[PDB]
Amino acid sequence: MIVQLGKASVTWTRADLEAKLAGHARVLIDVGTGDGRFVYRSAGAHPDTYCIGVDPAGERMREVSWRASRKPARGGRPNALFVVASVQALPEELAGLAHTLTLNFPWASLLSALVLPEAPVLEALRRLVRPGGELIALLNQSVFDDRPYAARLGLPELSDAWLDDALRPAYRAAGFEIRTSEIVTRLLTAEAIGG
Template structure:
């Protein structure tokens, strides 16, 4: 699979990945990671976790992927075609403020995305999503409707889901992603959190 550090792109095979993961029991994956700030934040504060950021847009990842952290990795991939090397490895998946085709696939229950999420999940894996109203308005629906659709699609795809919860702007401000900060201080700080575990 293609990984990135700064401007350098590197191919990492299963053997190389297993070497990197050797001393870590908990693997987190942030899908649609954007600039990777969240991954860097988690990796710096949790040296026993291995944190992987995945995004289809390499330009966004340049800054934070440059940090030399032994427990962080940035992968260039489409959410609908997650690399097979990740299969069965991930204990916790996060999707923060998806837009574009990632949001579209969540809303339609796209099997390529749903099967990929299941494939990368370790036994008892958990998932956490944060959705914002602006992205859903752009996708043609209100936040509650979009969140309910995604909730239903994840249920159908085999996740045991908790009831969606509103995110206060205080909660948004405390979430260390670039978009959370933008939203918290923007005009429409409305967001919903979804979480669940694999059945």
């Protein structure tokens, strides 16, 4: 697994991670964390939660990961971690860990994967969540569009009918049960199920 520590990227094993997790009651993973500030704040607010931000470009997390690795008097938060990975290849070391997995304002490609939805993406996310844990997505169509031009068809409105035919069954087919779908930007949450 690749961990960002300021400008350095470092390799961790599952045993390294487990050494850090020990003592914490909960785990939060934030996928596509960007500058990672959501993870930094969450680590301060929830000292009992190990908070992990993931993003494909380690340079985005340089600042926050440096800050968070300092001594606590100088701003460090030992329950925060920043990991470099893409959603199509998330580290196996994170499998089955999250009590909460957050996607805050995903870019268009990932947004589409959650609302169409796309099975390989839902399965990749479900892999990170422990049974009974929760996926929470904040969805907004004004995000950066990273899609190929040929794929910029319109996205569906998340009406009750869309939820009924497209989303509920597809999420279930990936191991999730949709719980909440509401306008706050849309909030969509689902519970990791099975067994």
